[PDB]
Nucleic acid binder design. Sequence first.
DNA 1: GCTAAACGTCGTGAGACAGTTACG
DNA 2: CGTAACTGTCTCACGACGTTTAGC
Lengths: 152, 152
Amino acid sequence: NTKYNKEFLLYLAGFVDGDGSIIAQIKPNQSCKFKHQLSLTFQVTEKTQRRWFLDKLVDEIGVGYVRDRGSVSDYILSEIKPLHNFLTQLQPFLKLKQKQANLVLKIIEQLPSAKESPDKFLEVCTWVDQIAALNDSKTRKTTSETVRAVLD
Amino acid sequence: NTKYNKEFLLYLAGFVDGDGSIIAQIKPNQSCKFKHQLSLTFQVTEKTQRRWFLDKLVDEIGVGYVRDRGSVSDYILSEIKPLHNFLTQLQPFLKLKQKQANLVLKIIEQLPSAKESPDKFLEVCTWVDQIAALNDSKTRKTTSETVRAVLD
DNA sequence: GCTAAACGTCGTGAGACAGTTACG
DNA sequence: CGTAACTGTCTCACGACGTTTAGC
Ligand SMILES: [Mg+2]
Ligand SMILES: [Mg+2]
Ligand SMILES: [Mg+2]
């Protein structure tokens, strides 16, 4: 559980507000109690020629990984605990995505309790709804609404 | 000459490296001594539904303006003096566009010189090529080469 | 049964200049 | 005349996703 340099966060908050994305997704999964797993993601996207910058982030944030997908690459961070540690420290420097960041933290803290009450699950699935709402969401298919089909 | 807040500069540098663009252009123009105007531009593009972030920048940088081009907007800054002043302070924090930033300071500084000889001008046009080669240039027409076709 | 590294992609939201003009 | 503003717009470079495989 590491604490990052302040100037590092200021710069990164800016980069994230630029080419980054704080994502929340309701992933349909047929093994989970409620037929869906919650998934959280901090990601930065850059043309593959600039893959080194992303590779560097791995080192600096000290967790996460970089993958390839064509002419573009991504730094990806989904591990729930390191993700909370990171966002908690980045969150106060963000400007275009401060809200989704705090919605993500909020979702993580309310994770265990989301496992019990099927209604507390919905509520948390609401959190993710708000996030896609704030982003420039377009190709979204699985919403908290579809989780309504958790009625049987 | 306005002094900028270092935290503002760190965050902005990150944002610039993301949605920003540092550009130098060789604009053909039949009223200049060498039939080409040297143009410099610092810009940040953002979806129009987010132009408040660009308006904010107009207020914080103190110079520059915002233009609308449909679904997206741009903060633009081309005035030589404020530009050179702004880049000098921002440059030390850029990670991805530092070189083009520095090439711009270098060009702006050689303006008068290049304004007194077809050779300096030529060399300076060569500076513009490097910037272009550093960016993800895809629709560039005029180059130092096209300018050399002035030799006659 | 839930986290999570992989893997695949719709529709832009950007980056990046082209071209022409009004004026200081 | 010379430097910036006004105006255009191509070609993506990312954003905000969906689905499969790994594995304890
Ligand atoms: Mg952006
Ligand atoms: Mg971007
Ligand atoms: Mg970018």
